[PDB]
Write a protein that binds this ligand. Structure first.
Ligand SMILES: O=C(c1ccc2nc(C3CCCCC3)oc2c1)N1CC(N2CCN(c3ncccn3)CC2)C1
Length: 289
């Protein structure tokens, strides 16, 4: 019996098998009646789909069918943890899931919501299907990395590759600098489905590939979007938010900057998180009326 990394049989769980034969754990939040639209939620590196429960419940309350999976190497899905052969695998697997849901609900508009790496995945998914998605909501998407961090990582990756240095990775995710809400930090840290290990050089290289590919995709993007960004984001530099506003060709694009807020806006201080939920609710409501 194929089992999750936590030893639970997939036969008992919602799942999909991707093109590489790997089982991905799925999550669904369906309203009681006919949905007005579909929305795929794309989580970031080191986390998983269960971290979106409250956002998904809000969106389902707007009569959308919300759906997600754990990206390969994450959460309850198969794969070596926080490894991917090529970043495109994530996008391919999103497109499989979206295509399979759309055929079950033909004619319904489909939105994307993504955070951080999951925002880069959203951008690249929309760009691979020009004109197809109804909208995207991006919470601190990975567009430009913090320049000092990116340089540090490139130097590390070069040392590791050009001197074959062993047992060296980049640092782990530091949740304490990614939200001001200490309670949320503690909740995240004790989640059994996150990855707390150092980021491997091979995965970092794929995140740099994502950044490069995002920049090439931006001038091609036409999908409507809402972009939410914290000014004190230590991971996804706010300069990237401005680059997305500048280069996307979308006729419907809006940016809200949260002054002083850190990266994880949907798990931030209550004044910020409450606003984030409100803004997403209004923006999606207006576009599914
Ligand atoms: O997608 C990411 C992520 C993680 C690590 C990264 N490193 C880079 C750069 C580094 C330089 C080279 C180019 C790539 O980009 C990343 C993106 N995620 C999702 C985010 N996490 C943070 C922790 N979280 C959290 N923290 C506190 C409270 C609640 N949740 C959940 C979401 C981080």
């Amino acid at each position: 019996p194929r089992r999750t990394p936590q030893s639970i049989p997939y036969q008992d769980l919602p799942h999909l098998v991707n093109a590489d034969g790997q089982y991905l754990f799925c999550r669904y939040w369906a309203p009681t009646g006919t949905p007005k639209a579909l929305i795929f939620v794309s989580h970031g590196a080191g986390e998983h789909s269960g971290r979106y429960e409250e956002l998904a419940r809000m969106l389902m309350g707007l009569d959308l069918l919300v759906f997600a999976h754990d990206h390969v190497g994450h959460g309850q899905s198969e794969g070596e943890r926080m490894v991917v052969s090529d970043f495109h695998v994530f996008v391919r697997d999103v497109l499989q899931h979206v295509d399979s849901m759309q055929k079950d609900y033909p004619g319904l508009p489909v939105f994307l919501l993504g955070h951080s790496m999951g925002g880069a995945i959203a951008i690249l998914t929309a760009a691979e299907r020009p004109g197809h998605f109804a909208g995207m909501v991006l919470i601190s998407p990975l567009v430009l990395a913090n320049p000092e961090s990116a340089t540090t990582f490139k130097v590390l990756a070069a040392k590791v590759l050009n001197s074959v240095l062993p047992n060296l990775s980049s640092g782990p995710i530091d949740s304490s600098v990614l939200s001001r809400n200490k309670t949320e930090v503690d909740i995240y840290n004790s989640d059994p489905l996150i990855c707390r290990a150092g980021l491997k050089v091979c995965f970092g290289i794929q995140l740099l590939n994502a950044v490069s590919r995002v920049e090439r995709a931006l001038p091609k993007l036409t999908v409507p979007f809402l972009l939410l960004q914290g000014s004190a984001d230590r991971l996804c530099d706010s300069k990237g938010a401005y680059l997305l506003m500048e280069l996307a060709k979308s006729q419907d694009k809006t940016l809200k900057i949260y002054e002083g807020a850190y990266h994880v806006l949907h798990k931030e201080l209550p004044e910020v998180t409450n606003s984030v939920f409100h803004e997403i609710n209004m923006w999606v409501s207006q576009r599914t009326a």
